[PDB]
């Protein structure tokens, strides 16, 4: 339920 | 003749005031419906202290108390109307130089 965006580039 | 520094905090049913005079003698603590008075004789210099505080809101003093510990004179006032929050101790908005808030036992009971 957690937004797990991972910093990309 | 000078006032004695104090600290105060409150709970859902009682207002607590703790004075700071070490090794007090013959303290005369007297409550009133809208006023508080305090006249001690303490310290090493045998100086005289006197604190006259106008209470912010009516309270019942018959169930009040105090406990003259050799470190501090811890008063405890019984709130007249349960649940009534107090924003400040004294009627007049002008800040008193010797009155603070005891943030160690301060608690947001209104939760």
């Amino acid at each position: 339920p957690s937004i797990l965006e991972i910093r990309t580039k | 003749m000078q006032p004695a520094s104090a600290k105060w905090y409150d709970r859902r049913d009682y207002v607590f005031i703790e004075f700071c005079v070490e090794d007090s003698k013959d303290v005369n603590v007297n409550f009133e419906k809208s006023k508080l008075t305090f006249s001690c004789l303490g310290g090493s210099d045998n100086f005289k202290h006197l604190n006259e505080i106008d209470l912010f809101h009516c309270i019942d003093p018959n169930d009040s108390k105090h406990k003259r510990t050799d470190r501090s004179i811890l008063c405890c006032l019984r709130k007249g109307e349960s649940g009534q929050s107090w924003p400040r101790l004294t009627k007049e908005r002008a800040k008193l130089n010797w009155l603070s808030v005891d943030f160690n036992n301060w608690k947001d009971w209104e939760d």
Partner: protein, 623 residues
């Protein structure tokens, strides 16, 4: 028996080793302590001179100074304050845990325009963190000069002075250690002063050649009443505080009274800074000033994570501080600061809403924070939804609000309809809305990935629930004639439903008839309990999700049928003629797959669909 009575004492040899070695961890706040002491002195003299204006006869310009002299390797702090006599020297600088500031403030009239920094009594002895033997010069108005030379070695030698007259005020002279010489530069001194004591009320001047290059040219405007400041001086203060080259977008000025009191300023930047959701080690936006001295900036308790974009200043008068004067005691207090900041930021947004000229500028940059707060914040989920603008069918290019949709809603609708997709052109032309748009009812487009998270926690609005148009039951406000029409169509289309079910085993739970298509053939929908069709595409690309729950709450697909398309109308006759025809068993699968592509689903090994298409291309090419 007998009782002996004694008196507590103090080990004045270890009591200073504690104050120097242990209390203070940062070897930079010595300048802040000295500056604060100078400010106390200046406030003392300024308040005393309010009665007899002749006290300034020995000196008129109240000020502070800093004169680093590398040749002598001393950091002089010239001053023009109250000073202090010999008895005051011996009873204020030689007594650990004794401060004349508190005793002075306790002996002044009830209510005055003065507020002093420092009550503990150990601040000065922090000057031996980065210095050798100290030397203090002083001159009161009731005495002569007295040099004060100590080195924190159990001694302090007041003596008579014969040097140059100072007129009125102290002159501290440190002696920096050999390795700590790096505080005589322009850069280091400027950085320390700007970081710690920028908002001191008196001018500070760094005499280094001689060029009086003042370091304190900005002033604290949060103390002044808001009605006095113009909407342009806020811009100058924002530009100076943040180094931004554009004015602020919105501003809020409020104060709170009670057992906890503070003032605050809140600026909403013009354009959101890049890399906003990356820095997890430092956010330092809502600074905390106590009596105009820096305290801390990095504590999540000050403001929730989803309000990261707000940048401002919060000033308080009488908060409790740790003995180092760097950390806030009673870390349970911050639950009131957060609760008082959030409900004021939301009022700032509410008042910014009624100016629909720059609300586009605000929204285009700060929509994601709102749509994330709706997902996380469980208390403001009511007031945080009315600030949402969504593209709808009956709008075109201009965004509209939910409270406008409810105002334009039909008298017979009992819910709000919405559809989730990838873009706007894809969503508008989709097969699901073909009957909703035909009846006349509006639709809400949700073309953002965060919208799924926003609508999981949203369940209704103004008493009306959000029902999707890609779920099982889409109860249109249907007329009674279409009930019997549906009964006829259902009773006329069973055999085809079971035949399609027996060919589509283990793929679709149950094949039914449709009530949401007008022109397009069969479309695929999902079930209520479980992720929608679009949310799977998101949750299968999060890259930080456990793999055990994918197969548990995936979906339940349900094929449908449009009872008017010739492709199915002739298919029913062909099925009734011979229910085991091969062409039917190929056409039904091809139709299922090409309907599956319509929805936001994905197949497994699409090569089996590419080959199906290639074979029937070869059929048409005559090869």
């Amino acid at each position: 028996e007998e009782v002996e009575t004694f008196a507590f004492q103090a080990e004045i040899a270890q009591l200073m080793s504690l104050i120097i070695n242990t209390f203070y961890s940062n070897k930079e706040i010595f300048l802040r302590e000295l500056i604060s002491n100078a400010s106390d002195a200046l406030d003392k003299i300024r308040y005393e001179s309010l009665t007899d204006p002749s006290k300034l006869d020995s000196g008129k310009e109240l000020k502070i100074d800093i004169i680093p002299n590398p040749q002598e390797r001393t950091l002089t702090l010239v001053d023009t304050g109250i000073g202090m006599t010999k008895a005051d020297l011996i009873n204020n600088l030689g007594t650990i845990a004794k401060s004349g500031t508190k005793a002075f403030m306790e002996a002044l009239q009830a209510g005055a325009d003065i507020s002093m920094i420092g009550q503990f009594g150990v601040g000065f002895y922090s000057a031996y963190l980065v210095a050798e033997k100290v030397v203090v010069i002083t001159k009161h108005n009731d005495d002569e000069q007295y040099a004060w030379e100590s080195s924190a070695g159990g001694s302090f030698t007041v003596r008579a002075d014969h040097g140059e007259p100072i007129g009125r005020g102290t002159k501290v002279i440190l002696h920096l250690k050999e390795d700590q010489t790096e505080y005589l530069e322009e850069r280091r001194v400027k950085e320390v002063v700007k970081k710690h004591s920028q908002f001191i009320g008196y001018p500070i001047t760094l005499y280094l050649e001689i060029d009086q290059e003042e370091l304190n040219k900005t002033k604290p405007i949060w103390t002044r009443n808001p009605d006095d400041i113009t909407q342009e001086e806020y811009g100058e203060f924002y530009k100076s505080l943040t180094n931004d080259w554009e004015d602020h977008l919105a501003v809020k000025h409020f104060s709170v009274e009670g057992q906890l009191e503070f003032r605050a300023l809140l600026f909403i930047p013009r354009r959101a800074p890049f890399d906003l959701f990356e820095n997890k080690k430092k956010k330092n936006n809502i600074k905390l000033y106590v009596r105009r001295v820096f305290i801390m900036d990095s504590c999540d308790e000050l403001i929730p994570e989803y309000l990261n974009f707000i940048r401002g200043v919060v000033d308080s008068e009488d908060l409790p501080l740790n003995i180092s004067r760097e950390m806030l005691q009673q870390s349970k207090i911050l639950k009131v600061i957060r609760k008082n900041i959030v409900k004021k930021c939301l009022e700032l947004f509410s008042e910014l809403a009624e100016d629909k000229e720059n609300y586009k500028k605000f929204y285009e940059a700060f929509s994601k924070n709102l749509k994330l707060g709706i997902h996380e914040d469980s208390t403001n989920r009511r007031r945080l939804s009315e600030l949402l603008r969504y593209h709808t069918s009956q709008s075109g290019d201009e965004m509209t609000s939910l409270s406008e949709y409810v105002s334009r809603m039909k008298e017979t609708q009992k819910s709000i309809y919405y559809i989730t997709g990838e873009s706007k052109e894809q969503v508008a032309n989709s097969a699901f809305v073909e009957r909703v748009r035909k009846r006349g009812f509006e639709v809400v487009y949700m073309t953002e990935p965060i919208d799924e998270y926003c609508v999981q926690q949203l369940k209704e609005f103004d008493g009306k629930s959000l029902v999707s148009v890609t779920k099982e039951g889409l109860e249109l406000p249907e007329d009674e004639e279409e009930k019997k029409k549906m009964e006829e169509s259902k009773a006329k289309f069973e055999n085809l439903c079971k035949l399609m079910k027996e060919i589509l085993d283990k793929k679709v739970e149950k094949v039914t008839i449709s009530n949401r298509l007008v022109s397009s053939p069969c479309c695929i929908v999902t079930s209520t309990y479980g992720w929608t069709a679009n949310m799977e595409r998101i949750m299968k690309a999060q890259a930080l999700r456990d793999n055990s729950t994918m197969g548990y709450m995936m979906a339940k697909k349900h094929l449908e049928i449009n009872p008017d398309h010739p492709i199915v109308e002739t298919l029913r006759q062909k099925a009734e003629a011979d229910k085991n025809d091969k062409a039917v068993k190929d056409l039904v699968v091809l139709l299922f797959e090409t309907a599956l592509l319509s929805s936001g689903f994905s197949l497994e090994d699409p090569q089996t669909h590419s080959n199906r298409i290639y074979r029937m291309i070869k059929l048409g090419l005559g090869i």
